[PDB]
Amino acid sequence: LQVTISLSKVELSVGESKFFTCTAIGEPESIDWYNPQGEKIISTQRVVVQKEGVRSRLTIYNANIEDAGIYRCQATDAKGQTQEATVVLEIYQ
Amino acid sequence: LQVTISLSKVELSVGESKFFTCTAIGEPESIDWYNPQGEKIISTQRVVVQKEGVRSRLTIYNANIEDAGIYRCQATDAKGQTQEATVVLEIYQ
């Protein structure tokens, strides 16, 4: 048994910060995050991704109105086949 | 491959409404939601749970300050063994 609670869309207020956990059940080889502009997110000082085994944590710090958009988590097994989940970030104020 | 994005805690504003999706990967026989007071949630007019196959959707409508708390999703395989995930609901304003 693996149980998860996931959300379609999350609302954030400017200045707030939140982390999202992505989980690949299977024998996933890689898990990456893609920002609402198509680009694999590389940890910065303010948006960090820390892979915690079979899970990957994207933490958005000090949110701003430009962080809005669809984020993708994308998993990859060892024969190069992918699978993904998307969460929608809204920024208010 | 099964991919999911889940949150530790979600903040809601009074009057707002949001749905949470719980997923049990395995051969889950049942999936139930427990409100922050320990009780299996029974669909009302305002808080509905609709089981969608291997997933269960808890929708909280017209949120109020009393909806705050920890919610549990709890899955049960056919030999009565359980497993769970918890999300934290905060209500502001």
UniProtKB/Swiss-Prot annotation, chains A, B:
Disulfide-linked positions: C22-C73
Compartment annotation: Cell membrane
Limits of the Ig-like C2-type domain: 1-88
Tissue expression per record: Expressed most strongly in adult and fetal brain.
Role summary: May play important roles in selective fasciculation and zone-to-zone projection of the primary olfactory axons.
Name of this chain's protein: Neural cell adhesion molecule 2
Highest classification ranks of the organism: Eukaryota, Metazoa, Chordata, Craniata, Vertebrata
Gene (UniProt): NCAM2
